[PDB]
Design an enzyme around this catalytic site. Sequence first.
Site, mmCIF file in Angstrom:
data_model
loop_
_atom_site.group_PDB
_atom_site.id
_atom_site.type_symbol
_atom_site.label_atom_id
_atom_site.label_comp_id
_atom_site.label_asym_id
_atom_site.label_seq_id
_atom_site.Cartn_x
_atom_site.Cartn_y
_atom_site.Cartn_z
ATOM 1 N N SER A 41 -10.167 63.983 -74.516
ATOM 2 C CA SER A 41 -9.432 62.741 -74.405
ATOM 3 C C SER A 41 -9.395 62.364 -72.977
ATOM 4 O O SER A 41 -10.396 62.324 -72.307
ATOM 5 C CB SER A 41 -8.024 62.811 -74.978
ATOM 6 N N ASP A 59 -13.186 58.865 -84.814
ATOM 7 C CA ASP A 59 -11.975 58.860 -84.007
ATOM 8 C C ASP A 59 -11.375 57.462 -84.024
ATOM 9 O O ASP A 59 -11.953 56.523 -83.473
ATOM 10 C CB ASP A 59 -12.287 59.316 -82.586
ATOM 11 N N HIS A 88 -10.033 63.349 -84.080
ATOM 12 C CA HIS A 88 -9.740 63.355 -82.655
ATOM 13 C C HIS A 88 -9.663 64.772 -82.123
ATOM 14 O O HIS A 88 -10.309 65.115 -81.129
ATOM 15 C CB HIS A 88 -8.437 62.615 -82.385
#
Lengths: 799, 846, 272, 127
Positions: free
Chosen positions: B713, B791, B823
């Site tokens: 991320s 995602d 994710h």
Amino acid sequence: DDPAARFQVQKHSWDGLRSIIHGSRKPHDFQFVQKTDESGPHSHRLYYLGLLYSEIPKKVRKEALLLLSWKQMLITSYDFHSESGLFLFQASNSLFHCRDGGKNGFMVSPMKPLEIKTQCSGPRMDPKICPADPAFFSFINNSDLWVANIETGEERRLTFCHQGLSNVLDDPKSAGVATFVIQEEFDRFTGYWWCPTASWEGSEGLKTLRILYEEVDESEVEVIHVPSPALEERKTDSYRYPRTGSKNPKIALKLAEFQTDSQGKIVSTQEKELVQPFSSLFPKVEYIARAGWTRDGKYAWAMFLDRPQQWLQLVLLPPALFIPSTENEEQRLASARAVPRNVQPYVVYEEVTNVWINVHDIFYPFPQSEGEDELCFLRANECKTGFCHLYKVTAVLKSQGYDWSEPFSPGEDEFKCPIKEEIALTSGEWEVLARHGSKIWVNEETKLVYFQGTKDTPLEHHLYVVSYEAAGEIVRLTTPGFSHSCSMSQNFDMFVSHYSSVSTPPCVHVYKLSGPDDDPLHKQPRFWASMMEAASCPPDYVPPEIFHFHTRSDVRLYGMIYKPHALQPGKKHPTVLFVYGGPQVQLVNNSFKGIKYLRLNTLASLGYAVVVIDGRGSCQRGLRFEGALKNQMGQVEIEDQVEGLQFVAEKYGFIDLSRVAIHGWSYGGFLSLMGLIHKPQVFKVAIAGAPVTVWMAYDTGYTERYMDVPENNQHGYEAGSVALHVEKLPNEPNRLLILHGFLDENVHFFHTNFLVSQLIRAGKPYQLQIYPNERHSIRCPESGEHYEVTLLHFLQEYL
Amino acid sequence: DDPAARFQVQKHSWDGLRSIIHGSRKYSGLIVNKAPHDFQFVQKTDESGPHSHRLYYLGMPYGSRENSLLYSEIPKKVRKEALLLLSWKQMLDHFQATPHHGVYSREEELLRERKRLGVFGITSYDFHSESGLFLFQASNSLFHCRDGGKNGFMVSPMKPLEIKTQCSGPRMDPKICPADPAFFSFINNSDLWVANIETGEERRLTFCHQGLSNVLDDPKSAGVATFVIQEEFDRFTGYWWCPTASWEGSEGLKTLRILYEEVDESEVEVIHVPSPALEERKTDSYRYPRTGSKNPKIALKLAEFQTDSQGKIVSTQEKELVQPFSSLFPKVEYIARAGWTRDGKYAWAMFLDRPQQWLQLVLLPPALFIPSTENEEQRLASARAVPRNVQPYVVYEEVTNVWINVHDIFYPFPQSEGEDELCFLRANECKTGFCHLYKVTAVLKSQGYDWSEPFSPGEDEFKCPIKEEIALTSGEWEVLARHGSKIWVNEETKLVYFQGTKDTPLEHHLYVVSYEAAGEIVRLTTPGFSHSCSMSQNFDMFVSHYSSVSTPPCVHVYKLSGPDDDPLHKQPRFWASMMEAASCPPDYVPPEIFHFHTRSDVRLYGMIYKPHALQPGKKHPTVLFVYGGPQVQLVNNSFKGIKYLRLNTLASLGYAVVVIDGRGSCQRGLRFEGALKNQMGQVEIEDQVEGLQFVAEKYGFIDLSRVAIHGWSYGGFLSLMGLIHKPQVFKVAIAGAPVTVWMAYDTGYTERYMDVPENNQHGYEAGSVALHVEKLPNEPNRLLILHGFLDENVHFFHTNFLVSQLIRAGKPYQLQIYPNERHSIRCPESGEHYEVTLLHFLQEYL
Amino acid sequence: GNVDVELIDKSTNRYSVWFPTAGWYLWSATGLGFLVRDEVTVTIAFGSWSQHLALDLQHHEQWLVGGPLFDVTAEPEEAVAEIHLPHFISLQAGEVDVSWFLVAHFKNEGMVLEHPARVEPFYAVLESPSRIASGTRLSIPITSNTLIYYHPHPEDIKFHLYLVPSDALLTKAIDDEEDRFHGVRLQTSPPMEPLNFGSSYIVSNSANLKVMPKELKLSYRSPGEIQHFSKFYAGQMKEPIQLEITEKRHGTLVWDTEVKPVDLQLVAASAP
Amino acid sequence: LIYYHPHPEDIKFHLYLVPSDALLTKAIDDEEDRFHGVRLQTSPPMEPLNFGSSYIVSNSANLKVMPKELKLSYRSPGEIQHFSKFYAGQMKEPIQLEITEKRHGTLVWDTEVKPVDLQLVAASAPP
């Protein structure tokens, strides 16, 4: 193994590889029109894309290479109408037209093309000029057929099945277009066909003008979302993609008529439909491969095809078979009585096979003016002898007499005509080119048919002529040792040939058939003038050597090889087996590959052996050759490629069998993955571009033709569905590079995605490369430069 | 640079690396346990039985592979010198609470991505104390049971009763009515429903959704939190029961209110993201609000209904504010939180501005909501009917120059002593820079509003004046309020139990203070560990699930015990234990936490994993793992072996593992977090580089020629910032799920930290790595991009636009896709592949 | 002296035992020293470790189990003063602490872990119980499970079948009810049990011991291992074939991680 | 994914013409073994002795049984689960078809590279 008798490629930096790829990169649609001035210098004008024109002189001088200048008249596809001379084409956002030497004169200075304004919201797809009336033309707008007029500017809708409410998931009926599977498997890019002649109803003065079109109800077809090119907005486009096994679009043929006053206004209009439903009149008919009309306009023909694609049949649909179409079932019965009982559709020709039907766009009807039944045509038929051959076919149009108001189920040989004769105009172990926009040219005065074929060798496309009356002998017109794409005048006195060889670049020469008129078969083709010449073959470019060989089953396969530049005998160079291997593509032929296959020469210039093999299952060698992949797709071709590699290893002494790369796009990638599964000891690495990893996800038209149905051929779907065999991929890394364009509507990203999914689930490594802006082939030069430098890096490091 | 003094990692085969990663997880069947949570203490009140309480919680004793409802028996007296460890008795009769192959519905699966729920089974349940009602969600359906209300405390487990329904679809977000436990409520197809246990009758309350087609054509939802709220405001509910029942006094009918959020996401950009069923090859539409693009248009609404004595929903009624929400509360974009006061008098709601620099708390009394009917004369009629004195009271208004952090801490007190002057406990980080509790008394004096005529409120229209705002805590440390932290307020002893970082920022400790007179902050948890705690309802005992960097996590039950006249200094004595410290494995060397100072003289913390079998002299290659973004603190004194075991696997292969919590990390104050405001991505990587350079100077095994930056991320985004602006520092960069264009990321996160994109455009471009691909290295094999294909949070577009701009700039990359992973990589096989890919990439190319 | 038993139920293995008066009263058939002060009507049963733990502490490798489980109920309030409870794990000064030893108790509470006062080389003491499922033994090593070092005792059976002796070598730790009911499970291949003991040296857990006679016959399953299981189970046995009526057999149990042996036993076929 | 104490047992019968085994890889508990040992007897085998698995096995993971030679081999993927008493366990019932002497079986995991059980049985003392 000898420790220093194997060539090591020089490990270049990425920017070095860019320097090499950048340093590597440092006409068609011909229409002859006569002049007939009897005092000027030029006999004709040749029109072509390059829109341009040339001036063909009445007599050239001997011992002088005449090269015509490319003068500007003012576009990838245009339409032309001979007599009034209309050139209708599509610009960036608009339609255009011009005219040459009709009631006006032949231009010499360039004129701007007149713009056609529109009331339509959206682009105007598929422009076609009416042959009967050059003032009128037609196009598709928002998946519906429109028609317009040049002089008055007024347009008119003809079909009313699509409303443009939303995306295609709720408004599924279209008219006048070819759907996806038809476009990409039956190679049809139009869904409406003008009648070439005009009928007269004789009410007051009305000139009728027919158009045959294909209605499609793809409501019961799977919708798939594919990413749009405009990636920032992060939306998809729906696509009615017929998955294999699942149901195709629901088809029907229909007539959109209208009439016109002498001043040229569309007064009336009319949708017309068959007396029965299409599905009921033609049971087990799934696809309209091709369609059109006879030249006189009397009957509208269409090639139908079934779900296995093993049953093709030509049908004639006379316009009186089509009643008007209305929702009220009593008017429907009314015109069911009104249709003549005698007139009915005549299934003239029916190919049936155990392998599959190849769609040949060769029908050509003759005038029916002698005894107004018994249609005589020239039909290509591969299913009879195994090779695509021309035929003259005379059927018998005898009416059985049908009460079209009461419904019925036709039998398996119900509308089939009996045949008078089926003379074969060609025969042999070679075929006539019929697919891929090849076509025949029929001189009806001299009774000759000019076609292209492979009689000398499969590697060379040659122009042949034969008589359709007397099938005596096949006369070649093109120069041998080259492969030719040719195009005739309508007056049949000179042609163009775009030709090349494995060594020379493409040239474009204009030849002229010339000789005694009494014997039309033996006109000698004399070189008249040349348009485009063989360019500077670069010293960086060494042309490939063609070879052939025999299998252990004694089948001859052809192949090419690009030799490593500055070869040192003894050294075993690493070898990239480039491959497509699948049908409809013949990689190896005697023709210049330097345009599309420059990367193979770059590989050679780095020192890679480049091998290319046409295994059995390739096109342009007949049905029995192509049919070795029936229900075993992936199982036989890789074996042919392996055998070709191993043969080339004995002949040429520069293939290291330990350092072997398999590489191919589309199918060349599906096979690269099959190569790495079933021959891991042979193939060290595999650069698979856009691979078809699961055949159950691919469309009907391709997959069903060869692997017929997953509920029937489940053993062969699993056996040749490479994504279910990931456990046999190598555990060691750097052996598998998957390339895929993210926007691919054809071999969807699901295929690469499911492969990567099953690689992860089986615990196997992979490298992967995305093309976010590329649909199927790499089109952008920046992306192609990235593609090639990635390929060179991957081979340098891991091969 | 001596090449014989630089440690080379042992080149393992791929199957070897799989063997290594699997051997890393061969003890993970025990240590990854989903330690118990969501506790509910219940008294027994016998004075002759053995057990003082019954503790209810979710847990996996690994008698089953799913998270399920359990209970423990808390005794009245334990033996001295005894570590009593409680059997986890099962609440339910050993059924399957998960669908086949771990699948869920589309609403269920999307909820667990927001809640980061990696565990299968009963993940969230609801409880109603005195009735003893347990309402939970299992395989595709609602269930219930009861334990020790009007019934007793059973010893064998019983099967849970099914709640049948006529409704088609999943029943999302169930909550029991507190005033009447027979009634409950849930979401069904984005509309609020209500049902009853005994009679089985249901009733819809809102009719804004119809189930026509995709979300592009039926855009109105109710009782749900949208994406950005669930995502950026850790709120997964959009309806709140009124905790008390009103009596209209018509005949006998008992009214029952619910506050819900109506949301009009019509003007919100729709994005298509691939579905998990990859074979079917469709996408799902998502109303995903980009920065710059419009947020959903929100509103609060009151849904009442009434009941007979027999328990039947006779009437129902939607109500709406007498003025429009957008007009009554201008410049209000987001409902961070909402709920009710305990007595039911006011429905509170925390509002927020689009820059999120402007928070204000508001009370909405139920009489402020007139009925809703289409006729504008009935509307005027009940606009006349609403009392003039009734208004919204803006109690508290936090304004700041960087951004508002959403703290869910409100806690209202009873108002029966002089029924104005509302007293609450509000957390305020923007005031002093650190999240601190306050007792705030605002003045609810009615100004008098003609609610029929439409007016525009001013800038300080409903803003109440404050009597006093005593600060219960103060310092350079924070009170934990985000991330499901909470306070527990005993009003009998006048104490408020909170969590905080007073001892160190690396340790969450339970503290208690008096809210009437706050002078002394008493810690209840043992030092040397970081604690996740949960108090009882009678405030006599709490649980703490705690751990340190060395020990694996344990769950101990402490009991406040001492003189009643001084409750602040009541001594927490270890009563009994739930979960013990797991096996710390011999291949797992626990990391060492350190700190250092910047050239700007601010203290940054960091972790390091030592290379196993370290040899002095050798300069080991170093993987700088990083997240770096806000709302996440990697460096803290808590067990890393659960989530970050892979970092130890790298260490066990010989990589130095460095982790730096630079400026912008959570739980270090607003001014610290606010160093990324308007330059997000530019200062964090500088702090990470400096953290590397410190570890290089301190410890003698950091090879600066061989440095990898890696993260998921936000970190992958930083990994790309590292490789862009620090190419001589970082050799490679393993970027997992990177945010490559901040113009594509959603409002709640991105706007809060950077700005609205037309306001700040220079810093969006500067900190969007996909626009700086020209600065990525020309030489190959330095950059590995990892991305989960499905995602919805950091969309595949980000990686796609990165790969696009790499191609367009002529720059190499390697790339790996996870087609079935959203994710966080949830499949163990897929995680095993991810780690073997990471080990291989470092082994070969670092 | 020896005390009688009354078998209430054979399935749960419940014994009622009368106790006359005060005394030491060691009963070595399970290993219980019931140091008692008066007439005690005591009830003892057999417990399995599988059904009473939290299911996490078998596989917690800082949590070695010792001893077998007993359901002991008796008269409280100094009627049974001391429990000398049978465990197996060894007692040397290095790598074993007295504080690592724990004694559990299985109530409807759950587990109550108390330290014992003194640790005897075979027994551990429980002081003044106040009571079901009380015969218990746990351990918390601060280091791993693999180094706590107590050795199994070999147990051998030579049985005559199709005129061919099949052997049965069993290497389990010394738990008397486990050993006895392992033999009762082994009654399906009906055994004769001579008296030979392999208590010469010590070996830890996670130990791979290879077995060999010095003279070589049809050798089956040589690299055996050291593990403990429930009361009803199948341990890692060895089943070689003698094939003849020969007299002499020399078995040897020897390590693999280091060169040292642990057991050398001599057995004759005088009583097949 | 909690590891269990295994019960491998291949229960044999000398039938009139084709003798039959029954391979079981099933995790131990008292009531499950006491169910199986008497309720397989309705299609009568007789209970053998063989080697219990030394290493420890995890649930939800398919195991592979390979005999060294060929036998009646259907349903070769073995799975481990815990049912109640009444339901039939996941079994193997091969038939060795003759009076041959020895038989060798091996248990191999899917994702491992290592075995977990190497059992041998002899038909020299057939029931």
